[PDB]
């Protein structure tokens, strides 16, 4: 009944829905109700879209950031096919007309009733775009594959849609009573408190008295703060730190206002979190491990039933050479000049605002309500924790609504991590993510995985769980599609555990042949087959190809899973790598950033022929990596095996020999330039991102000639110099030991790549600052965000970074 769905949702999201109920938290219950209605209502909107609108929902166009080609076309009811010559400049429509006409005149005697499906993928060609704007077509013009498409009539598209349906009156100091605490180790105990707005201190911190390493220590000590109850900003949070003195122990935070803006009065038991001293960015909800978490007991002094003032009441209440406090005062003084003449400097203005004074806040808020929308780039900055105010938060979201689905997809990883900054469950960001998610199935797909992958983390398990639940209410059908993916990943985990055990006790070929027998069990064949890929919902993983499955004899023994589809031919032979035991968030970020470089470069004419292959954490130290087909490690090739076509007289010739064995005759020259472009992209990418520990085992090359990096795990230093491998130069110089014309064009590719990136440098800084929310160990400080200082030399001009890049480039040809 409705129980079945609840059951399925509990299984999918990784948490029983009953566990939400058992909290009897009215904030939790209001979220679920309000968001369910919101999400069910979008679902209602979806069920009645035009068939082309539904195409846009479920299969958003995959577009690239004249000269004719072969295309293969068939219809849905018949396996009869027609091969056409068309131009890369032709619209899908023209192709559909040539398809309809040749059908008409073979069955004996309208294109607007059709769309073109890519064979074996959840991808479609439609809209008024030349064919060469479609990613699948571009991937065929480079692979030399022939595009195979299927004429799908509007009637069976609608069949798909339908089957997928379902008070400033308070003078006194604000003060706390610190009653007592309880859990321990090991000396003397102190409780440091603190009033914060974001990570701006609302006032001076106050420590408690030194008390003995008693367990259940006691204080009753009233703590009064240097700020009045009427001057607490809406988003004020009180932060505690409990430590030992002759060593940190725990921290815990909370909002002084509830989620209904009612200022908090009464007793609070604060279930604390373990430590590294005050941690304002930390979550405002208590440690769920109540059986063993230290708890701090406090009392919140009553003051009368007061609510934070409504917005109406709030509202009724040389400058250039900046783009020091005397400086800070000029900006606030000249704040009207900001709005009307420097609207995008809003961030800087908000940072000089006095958040501990309600009149200053009301003034700023009044300006904020008249403030014109900002560019996406400005808005990305405003989402950071250093802009905690809810109205600012909303303004930021409002400025983000013009995000295209392509950009939103690029930034989605960061928007999700920002959720960990929120103070309340119901928030504009959550509502925005959900809306976008319900309107674009690809967003929804990855929204889900970003949330599901962290459910093992107790500080976000609740929020993320609720969000996935609401989204499931918004698509009962996608939930089942998603369950299917989790069932496959559950089986891959079981299978991987067996391989870990078996390979320690027998040989690889024995483990492999029993990996195969495990896979051939019916529950495994069923679970592992006919699923959308979590790496890319548009990629369909049909028949699992057991005989080509294997595993790496390395480390975590990751699995190699191959698929084939008898309806895709070309685009159906694909593989995924399942890895359990490594943290993959790092790799995902890095590949995201490289993909964004690829976009920035490409949307300026420069195609460095990158390979941004998929990488998706799906669970605790668990995820998928997309297999890049027809590729090999530098290591395997430089191994210079006997017998092979690439066997060389000199080690430096192995790579170039390998390429020529893969690209005979004329074909070699394109492989060389591909190697060359891709080389320059990754050299610049790895230099800017600070990816070290680069070697022949983590660099690969495609038979096309394309070089790409894998297994990143580091970046930002956690300081790296530009890398130039002599064996690469040798390929670049087409083998000749002097070839300045080929070598200097390569030096050209690097510098332009570098300068393009240097222009959108702020974008990178904004995204990485947001990423700090993720708690990756390699991105924890200002010093990390600093490293992106030099790489991009954003302090300098023109380029007066001019010549940073010489030295690093000219140093790099040490090797
Ligand atoms: C290193 C390589 N990594 C990738 N290989 C491609 N093709 N695409 C990727 N995205 C990545 C990654 N990451 C790789 N990864 C594996 C992962 C799991 C299981 C196996 Cl059995 C392998 C494996 O054999 N190789 C390998 C392949 C060609 C030569 C030497 C070793």
mmCIF file of C-alpha atoms in Angstrom, residues 27-362:
data_model
loop_
_atom_site.group_PDB
_atom_site.id
_atom_site.type_symbol
_atom_site.label_atom_id
_atom_site.label_comp_id
_atom_site.label_asym_id
_atom_site.label_seq_id
_atom_site.Cartn_x
_atom_site.Cartn_y
_atom_site.Cartn_z
ATOM 1 C CA UNK A 27 11.114 20.615 13.366
ATOM 2 C CA UNK A 28 11.629 17.207 11.770
ATOM 3 C CA UNK A 29 7.860 16.594 11.400
ATOM 4 C CA UNK A 30 7.225 20.057 9.873
ATOM 5 C CA UNK A 31 10.015 19.465 7.337
ATOM 6 C CA UNK A 32 8.636 16.089 6.186
ATOM 7 C CA UNK A 33 5.094 17.456 5.862
ATOM 8 C CA UNK A 34 5.900 20.709 4.065
ATOM 9 C CA UNK A 35 8.514 19.192 1.743
ATOM 10 C CA UNK A 36 6.351 16.155 0.926
ATOM 11 C CA UNK A 37 3.563 18.470 -0.242
ATOM 12 C CA UNK A 38 6.091 20.557 -2.222
ATOM 13 C CA UNK A 39 7.686 17.451 -3.739
ATOM 14 C CA UNK A 40 4.337 15.721 -4.482
ATOM 15 C CA UNK A 41 3.145 18.885 -6.130
ATOM 16 C CA UNK A 42 6.172 19.075 -8.492
ATOM 17 C CA UNK A 43 5.495 15.434 -9.255
ATOM 18 C CA UNK A 44 1.967 16.535 -10.223
ATOM 19 C CA UNK A 45 3.393 19.208 -12.538
ATOM 20 C CA UNK A 46 5.651 16.587 -14.194
ATOM 21 C CA UNK A 47 2.905 14.110 -15.033
ATOM 22 C CA UNK A 48 1.221 16.657 -17.315
ATOM 23 C CA UNK A 49 4.193 18.079 -19.277
ATOM 24 C CA UNK A 50 4.202 18.159 -23.063
ATOM 25 C CA UNK A 51 6.094 15.130 -24.429
ATOM 26 C CA UNK A 52 9.031 17.321 -25.401
ATOM 27 C CA UNK A 53 9.046 18.849 -21.920
ATOM 28 C CA UNK A 54 9.108 15.335 -20.465
ATOM 29 C CA UNK A 55 12.021 14.456 -22.724
ATOM 30 C CA UNK A 56 13.755 17.505 -21.199
ATOM 31 C CA UNK A 57 12.954 16.277 -17.707
ATOM 32 C CA UNK A 58 14.080 12.672 -18.059
ATOM 33 C CA UNK A 59 16.743 12.912 -20.775
ATOM 34 C CA UNK A 60 18.247 16.402 -20.710
ATOM 35 C CA UNK A 61 20.248 17.225 -23.808
ATOM 36 C CA UNK A 62 23.918 16.410 -23.543
ATOM 37 C CA UNK A 63 25.479 19.229 -25.560
ATOM 38 C CA UNK A 64 29.099 20.138 -26.280
ATOM 39 C CA UNK A 65 30.375 23.079 -24.132
ATOM 40 C CA UNK A 66 30.226 21.781 -42.279
ATOM 41 C CA UNK A 67 31.378 18.185 -43.027
ATOM 42 C CA UNK A 68 29.141 15.170 -43.766
ATOM 43 C CA UNK A 69 28.800 11.966 -41.719
ATOM 44 C CA UNK A 70 27.218 8.522 -41.827
ATOM 45 C CA UNK A 71 24.275 7.950 -39.508
ATOM 46 C CA UNK A 72 22.307 4.739 -38.839
ATOM 47 C CA UNK A 73 18.563 5.071 -38.157
ATOM 48 C CA UNK A 74 15.784 2.599 -37.353
ATOM 49 C CA UNK A 75 12.295 2.796 -35.884
ATOM 50 C CA UNK A 76 10.941 1.299 -32.677
ATOM 51 C CA UNK A 77 8.833 -1.574 -33.980
ATOM 52 C CA UNK A 78 11.256 -3.050 -36.484
ATOM 53 C CA UNK A 79 14.914 -4.020 -36.679
ATOM 54 C CA UNK A 80 15.183 -2.687 -40.193
ATOM 55 C CA UNK A 81 17.826 -0.004 -40.477
ATOM 56 C CA UNK A 82 18.760 2.757 -42.934
ATOM 57 C CA UNK A 83 22.178 4.375 -43.355
ATOM 58 C CA UNK A 84 22.227 8.057 -44.404
ATOM 59 C CA UNK A 85 24.707 10.704 -45.372
ATOM 60 C CA UNK A 86 24.030 13.934 -43.476
ATOM 61 C CA UNK A 87 26.001 17.074 -42.638
ATOM 62 C CA UNK A 88 27.310 17.806 -39.140
ATOM 63 C CA UNK A 89 25.424 21.096 -39.658
ATOM 64 C CA UNK A 90 22.027 19.390 -40.092
ATOM 65 C CA UNK A 91 19.296 19.635 -37.460
ATOM 66 C CA UNK A 92 17.866 16.371 -36.008
ATOM 67 C CA UNK A 93 14.617 17.271 -37.812
ATOM 68 C CA UNK A 94 16.201 16.995 -41.267
ATOM 69 C CA UNK A 95 17.504 13.576 -40.320
ATOM 70 C CA UNK A 96 14.075 12.599 -39.071
ATOM 71 C CA UNK A 97 12.552 13.721 -42.355
ATOM 72 C CA UNK A 98 15.027 11.604 -44.311
ATOM 73 C CA UNK A 99 14.198 8.659 -42.020
ATOM 74 C CA UNK A 100 10.405 9.095 -42.410
ATOM 75 C CA UNK A 101 10.627 9.483 -46.204
ATOM 76 C CA UNK A 102 12.748 6.364 -46.694
ATOM 77 C CA UNK A 103 10.339 4.431 -44.445
ATOM 78 C CA UNK A 104 7.294 5.809 -46.326
ATOM 79 C CA UNK A 105 8.796 4.713 -49.612
ATOM 80 C CA UNK A 106 9.546 1.161 -48.589
ATOM 81 C CA UNK A 107 6.192 0.473 -46.951
ATOM 82 C CA UNK A 108 4.375 2.704 -49.513
ATOM 83 C CA UNK A 109 2.790 6.118 -48.748
ATOM 84 C CA UNK A 110 5.339 14.304 -39.366
ATOM 85 C CA UNK A 111 8.990 14.617 -38.243
ATOM 86 C CA UNK A 112 7.774 16.838 -35.372
ATOM 87 C CA UNK A 113 6.133 13.816 -33.762
ATOM 88 C CA UNK A 114 9.546 12.193 -33.158
ATOM 89 C CA UNK A 115 12.747 12.378 -31.201
ATOM 90 C CA UNK A 116 16.019 10.543 -31.782
ATOM 91 C CA UNK A 117 17.181 8.073 -29.141
ATOM 92 C CA UNK A 118 20.884 7.089 -29.054
ATOM 93 C CA UNK A 119 20.945 3.264 -29.350
ATOM 94 C CA UNK A 120 21.143 1.595 -25.940
ATOM 95 C CA UNK A 121 21.471 4.813 -23.898
ATOM 96 C CA UNK A 122 19.025 7.075 -22.065
ATOM 97 C CA UNK A 123 19.994 9.936 -24.307
ATOM 98 C CA UNK A 124 18.154 11.765 -27.003
ATOM 99 C CA UNK A 125 18.905 14.101 -29.861
ATOM 100 C CA UNK A 126 16.237 16.842 -30.248
ATOM 101 C CA UNK A 127 15.816 20.613 -30.367
ATOM 102 C CA UNK A 128 17.179 22.962 -33.035
ATOM 103 C CA UNK A 129 20.894 22.207 -32.867
ATOM 104 C CA UNK A 130 23.281 21.034 -35.547
ATOM 105 C CA UNK A 131 24.192 17.397 -34.968
ATOM 106 C CA UNK A 132 27.778 18.295 -34.120
ATOM 107 C CA UNK A 133 26.585 20.129 -30.977
ATOM 108 C CA UNK A 134 25.389 16.803 -29.540
ATOM 109 C CA UNK A 135 27.995 15.097 -27.331
ATOM 110 C CA UNK A 136 27.173 11.612 -28.666
ATOM 111 C CA UNK A 137 27.708 12.823 -32.210
ATOM 112 C CA UNK A 138 31.007 14.492 -31.256
ATOM 113 C CA UNK A 139 32.128 11.277 -29.551
ATOM 114 C CA UNK A 140 31.525 9.514 -32.866
ATOM 115 C CA UNK A 141 33.355 12.071 -35.017
ATOM 116 C CA UNK A 142 36.415 11.413 -32.829
ATOM 117 C CA UNK A 143 36.111 7.669 -32.343
ATOM 118 C CA UNK A 144 35.157 7.260 -35.993
ATOM 119 C CA UNK A 145 32.185 5.196 -34.805
ATOM 120 C CA UNK A 146 28.948 5.496 -36.789
ATOM 121 C CA UNK A 147 26.089 7.040 -34.795
ATOM 122 C CA UNK A 148 23.217 4.608 -34.345
ATOM 123 C CA UNK A 149 19.880 6.226 -33.565
ATOM 124 C CA UNK A 150 16.299 5.132 -33.107
ATOM 125 C CA UNK A 151 13.250 7.101 -34.247
ATOM 126 C CA UNK A 152 10.965 7.265 -31.249
ATOM 127 C CA UNK A 153 7.403 8.475 -31.765
ATOM 128 C CA UNK A 154 5.765 10.919 -29.326
ATOM 129 C CA UNK A 155 3.108 8.365 -28.377
ATOM 130 C CA UNK A 156 5.558 5.934 -26.772
ATOM 131 C CA UNK A 157 7.368 8.858 -25.086
ATOM 132 C CA UNK A 158 4.078 9.720 -23.337
ATOM 133 C CA UNK A 159 3.695 6.043 -22.484
ATOM 134 C CA UNK A 160 6.954 6.475 -20.518
ATOM 135 C CA UNK A 161 5.735 9.546 -18.669
ATOM 136 C CA UNK A 162 2.506 7.793 -17.729
ATOM 137 C CA UNK A 163 4.109 4.574 -16.496
ATOM 138 C CA UNK A 164 6.332 6.703 -14.245
ATOM 139 C CA UNK A 165 3.455 8.433 -12.456
ATOM 140 C CA UNK A 166 2.078 8.532 -8.935
ATOM 141 C CA UNK A 167 11.648 41.962 20.991
ATOM 142 C CA UNK A 168 14.126 44.850 20.934
ATOM 143 C CA UNK A 169 12.774 45.624 24.427
ATOM 144 C CA UNK A 170 15.571 43.771 26.217
ATOM 145 C CA UNK A 171 18.401 45.857 27.749
ATOM 146 C CA UNK A 172 20.084 43.198 29.882
ATOM 147 C CA UNK A 173 23.206 41.240 29.024
ATOM 148 C CA UNK A 174 22.401 37.976 27.353
ATOM 149 C CA UNK A 175 23.449 35.332 29.889
ATOM 150 C CA UNK A 176 23.606 31.525 30.330
ATOM 151 C CA UNK A 177 23.587 29.256 33.344
ATOM 152 C CA UNK A 178 26.152 26.447 33.011
ATOM 153 C CA UNK A 179 24.578 23.821 35.279
ATOM 154 C CA UNK A 180 26.889 20.787 34.896
ATOM 155 C CA UNK A 181 28.528 18.187 32.597
ATOM 156 C CA UNK A 182 29.307 14.434 32.831
ATOM 157 C CA UNK A 183 31.624 12.237 30.564
ATOM 158 C CA UNK A 184 35.486 12.256 30.950
ATOM 159 C CA UNK A 185 39.071 11.106 30.709
ATOM 160 C CA UNK A 186 42.282 11.638 32.755
ATOM 161 C CA UNK A 187 44.104 17.732 36.036
ATOM 162 C CA UNK A 188 41.228 20.223 35.613
ATOM 163 C CA UNK A 189 38.077 20.976 33.554
ATOM 164 C CA UNK A 190 37.076 24.195 31.742
ATOM 165 C CA UNK A 191 34.062 25.144 29.653
ATOM 166 C CA UNK A 192 34.741 27.944 27.143
ATOM 167 C CA UNK A 193 31.565 29.479 25.659
ATOM 168 C CA UNK A 194 31.162 31.841 22.696
ATOM 169 C CA UNK A 195 28.591 33.846 20.768
ATOM 170 C CA UNK A 196 28.952 33.608 16.975
ATOM 171 C CA UNK A 197 27.427 34.846 13.758
ATOM 172 C CA UNK A 198 28.991 32.607 11.117
ATOM 173 C CA UNK A 199 32.598 32.734 12.237
ATOM 174 C CA UNK A 200 32.383 36.365 13.303
ATOM 175 C CA UNK A 201 32.397 36.563 17.129
ATOM 176 C CA UNK A 202 29.327 38.443 18.381
ATOM 177 C CA UNK A 203 31.287 39.300 21.532
ATOM 178 C CA UNK A 204 33.986 38.310 23.963
ATOM 179 C CA UNK A 205 34.132 34.661 24.960
ATOM 180 C CA UNK A 206 33.755 33.652 28.614
ATOM 181 C CA UNK A 207 35.417 30.618 30.215
ATOM 182 C CA UNK A 208 34.034 28.774 33.245
ATOM 183 C CA UNK A 209 35.864 28.005 36.491
ATOM 184 C CA UNK A 210 38.592 25.399 36.693
ATOM 185 C CA UNK A 211 37.035 22.217 38.222
ATOM 186 C CA UNK A 212 38.697 18.814 38.971
ATOM 187 C CA UNK A 213 38.677 15.889 36.475
ATOM 188 C CA UNK A 214 35.558 14.743 38.194
ATOM 189 C CA UNK A 215 33.125 12.705 36.111
ATOM 190 C CA UNK A 216 29.726 14.448 36.134
ATOM 191 C CA UNK A 217 31.434 17.763 36.947
ATOM 192 C CA UNK A 218 29.313 20.582 38.373
ATOM 193 C CA UNK A 219 29.299 24.373 37.913
ATOM 194 C CA UNK A 220 25.847 26.070 38.356
ATOM 195 C CA UNK A 221 28.003 29.073 37.290
ATOM 196 C CA UNK A 222 26.029 31.754 35.443
ATOM 197 C CA UNK A 223 27.835 33.025 32.320
ATOM 198 C CA UNK A 224 26.934 36.528 31.135
ATOM 199 C CA UNK A 225 27.978 37.843 27.746
ATOM 200 C CA UNK A 226 28.959 41.339 26.653
ATOM 201 C CA UNK A 227 25.866 41.721 24.431
ATOM 202 C CA UNK A 228 22.208 42.591 24.998
ATOM 203 C CA UNK A 229 19.328 40.188 24.344
ATOM 204 C CA UNK A 230 17.932 42.734 21.854
ATOM 205 C CA UNK A 231 21.192 42.737 19.870
ATOM 206 C CA UNK A 232 21.374 38.992 19.069
ATOM 207 C CA UNK A 233 21.193 38.483 15.298
ATOM 208 C CA UNK A 234 18.605 35.954 14.060
ATOM 209 C CA UNK A 235 21.323 33.450 13.201
ATOM 210 C CA UNK A 236 23.277 33.833 16.437
ATOM 211 C CA UNK A 237 24.732 30.571 17.697
ATOM 212 C CA UNK A 238 26.178 29.834 21.108
ATOM 213 C CA UNK A 239 29.246 27.643 20.934
ATOM 214 C CA UNK A 240 30.684 25.557 23.760
ATOM 215 C CA UNK A 241 34.106 23.942 24.159
ATOM 216 C CA UNK A 242 34.875 21.548 27.035
ATOM 217 C CA UNK A 243 38.568 20.908 27.718
ATOM 218 C CA UNK A 244 41.103 19.776 30.319
ATOM 219 C CA UNK A 245 43.852 21.889 31.829
ATOM 220 C CA UNK A 246 46.829 21.286 34.118
ATOM 221 C CA UNK A 247 43.951 18.903 26.150
ATOM 222 C CA UNK A 248 40.679 19.197 24.185
ATOM 223 C CA UNK A 249 37.676 16.997 24.945
ATOM 224 C CA UNK A 250 34.440 18.043 23.280
ATOM 225 C CA UNK A 251 32.571 20.851 21.520
ATOM 226 C CA UNK A 252 28.848 21.618 20.900
ATOM 227 C CA UNK A 253 26.825 24.460 19.365
ATOM 228 C CA UNK A 254 23.239 25.700 19.281
ATOM 229 C CA UNK A 255 21.031 28.480 17.893
ATOM 230 C CA UNK A 256 19.657 30.981 20.447
ATOM 231 C CA UNK A 257 16.531 31.155 18.286
ATOM 232 C CA UNK A 258 14.417 28.133 17.469
ATOM 233 C CA UNK A 259 13.261 27.331 13.934
ATOM 234 C CA UNK A 260 10.106 29.338 14.596
ATOM 235 C CA UNK A 261 12.289 32.344 15.529
ATOM 236 C CA UNK A 262 11.167 32.009 19.138
ATOM 237 C CA UNK A 263 14.129 32.930 21.312
ATOM 238 C CA UNK A 264 15.148 29.977 23.428
ATOM 239 C CA UNK A 265 14.430 29.807 27.128
ATOM 240 C CA UNK A 266 14.828 26.850 29.453
ATOM 241 C CA UNK A 267 17.101 23.919 30.187
ATOM 242 C CA UNK A 268 19.168 22.261 27.471
ATOM 243 C CA UNK A 269 21.114 19.021 27.547
ATOM 244 C CA UNK A 270 23.816 19.314 24.879
ATOM 245 C CA UNK A 271 25.122 15.997 23.581
ATOM 246 C CA UNK A 272 28.681 16.996 22.667
ATOM 247 C CA UNK A 273 31.070 16.022 19.851
ATOM 248 C CA UNK A 274 34.777 14.945 20.188
ATOM 249 C CA UNK A 275 37.574 17.423 19.430
ATOM 250 C CA UNK A 276 40.385 18.171 16.909
ATOM 251 C CA UNK A 277 39.071 24.780 20.285
ATOM 252 C CA UNK A 278 35.722 26.542 19.759
ATOM 253 C CA UNK A 279 34.013 25.303 16.586
ATOM 254 C CA UNK A 280 31.335 27.718 15.284
ATOM 255 C CA UNK A 281 31.125 26.054 11.848
ATOM 256 C CA UNK A 282 30.280 22.747 13.565
ATOM 257 C CA UNK A 283 26.694 21.458 13.430
ATOM 258 C CA UNK A 284 24.015 22.955 15.697
ATOM 259 C CA UNK A 285 22.511 19.527 16.424
ATOM 260 C CA UNK A 286 23.590 17.241 19.260
ATOM 261 C CA UNK A 287 25.607 14.046 19.101
ATOM 262 C CA UNK A 288 23.189 11.124 18.417
ATOM 263 C CA UNK A 289 25.511 8.688 20.194
ATOM 264 C CA UNK A 290 23.817 9.668 23.487
ATOM 265 C CA UNK A 291 24.833 6.441 25.208
ATOM 266 C CA UNK A 292 28.503 7.495 25.208
ATOM 267 C CA UNK A 293 28.720 11.207 24.315
ATOM 268 C CA UNK A 294 29.659 13.734 26.976
ATOM 269 C CA UNK A 295 26.643 15.907 27.736
ATOM 270 C CA UNK A 296 26.752 19.518 28.839
ATOM 271 C CA UNK A 297 23.753 20.782 30.788
ATOM 272 C CA UNK A 298 22.821 24.434 30.567
ATOM 273 C CA UNK A 299 19.924 26.750 31.377
ATOM 274 C CA UNK A 300 18.644 29.552 29.155
ATOM 275 C CA UNK A 301 17.340 32.507 31.241
ATOM 276 C CA UNK A 302 13.771 33.558 30.467
ATOM 277 C CA UNK A 303 13.140 37.204 29.717
ATOM 278 C CA UNK A 304 9.344 37.622 29.874
ATOM 279 C CA UNK A 305 7.329 34.650 24.901
ATOM 280 C CA UNK A 306 9.472 36.637 22.388
ATOM 281 C CA UNK A 307 9.911 36.069 18.638
ATOM 282 C CA UNK A 308 12.641 37.531 16.439
ATOM 283 C CA UNK A 309 11.152 40.637 14.753
ATOM 284 C CA UNK A 310 9.307 40.063 11.466
ATOM 285 C CA UNK A 311 10.847 41.510 8.292
ATOM 286 C CA UNK A 312 8.383 44.419 8.057
ATOM 287 C CA UNK A 313 9.416 45.606 11.518
ATOM 288 C CA UNK A 314 13.109 45.200 10.531
ATOM 289 C CA UNK A 315 12.571 47.282 7.396
ATOM 290 C CA UNK A 316 10.667 50.035 9.175
ATOM 291 C CA UNK A 317 13.774 50.458 11.345
ATOM 292 C CA UNK A 318 39.191 56.246 -2.489
ATOM 293 C CA UNK A 319 36.346 53.913 -1.712
ATOM 294 C CA UNK A 320 37.371 52.235 -5.004
ATOM 295 C CA UNK A 321 41.074 51.716 -4.124
ATOM 296 C CA UNK A 322 39.748 49.171 -1.595
ATOM 297 C CA UNK A 323 38.718 46.905 -4.493
ATOM 298 C CA UNK A 324 41.861 47.820 8.275
ATOM 299 C CA UNK A 325 39.156 49.268 10.502
ATOM 300 C CA UNK A 326 39.417 52.845 9.194
ATOM 301 C CA UNK A 327 38.812 51.208 5.806
ATOM 302 C CA UNK A 328 35.931 49.121 7.212
ATOM 303 C CA UNK A 329 34.296 52.343 8.449
ATOM 304 C CA UNK A 330 34.505 54.033 5.055
ATOM 305 C CA UNK A 331 32.615 51.130 3.477
ATOM 306 C CA UNK A 332 29.780 51.069 5.983
ATOM 307 C CA UNK A 333 29.556 54.890 5.918
ATOM 308 C CA UNK A 334 29.420 54.770 2.115
ATOM 309 C CA UNK A 335 27.029 51.792 1.993
ATOM 310 C CA UNK A 336 24.437 53.519 -0.209
ATOM 311 C CA UNK A 337 27.216 54.157 -2.692
ATOM 312 C CA UNK A 338 27.826 50.406 -2.649
ATOM 313 C CA UNK A 339 24.307 49.457 -3.680
ATOM 314 C CA UNK A 340 23.979 52.053 -6.425
ATOM 315 C CA UNK A 341 27.535 52.017 -7.756
ATOM 316 C CA UNK A 342 29.197 48.760 -6.662
ATOM 317 C CA UNK A 343 26.277 46.300 -6.256
ATOM 318 C CA UNK A 344 28.548 43.260 -6.646
ATOM 319 C CA UNK A 345 30.688 44.396 -3.682
ATOM 320 C CA UNK A 346 27.763 43.372 -1.467
ATOM 321 C CA UNK A 347 29.787 40.544 0.135
ATOM 322 C CA UNK A 348 32.441 43.034 1.331
ATOM 323 C CA UNK A 349 29.744 45.279 2.719
ATOM 324 C CA UNK A 350 28.083 42.447 4.649
ATOM 325 C CA UNK A 351 31.502 41.641 6.139
ATOM 326 C CA UNK A 352 31.869 45.189 7.622
ATOM 327 C CA UNK A 353 28.343 45.257 8.992
ATOM 328 C CA UNK A 354 28.011 45.186 12.766
ATOM 329 C CA UNK A 355 26.060 42.003 13.406
ATOM 330 C CA UNK A 356 26.025 42.501 17.180
ATOM 331 C CA UNK A 357 23.955 45.715 16.762
ATOM 332 C CA UNK A 358 20.381 45.269 15.631
ATOM 333 C CA UNK A 359 20.003 48.740 14.138
ATOM 334 C CA UNK A 360 23.075 48.252 11.925
ATOM 335 C CA UNK A 361 21.665 44.885 10.896
ATOM 336 C CA UNK A 362 18.220 46.371 10.169
#
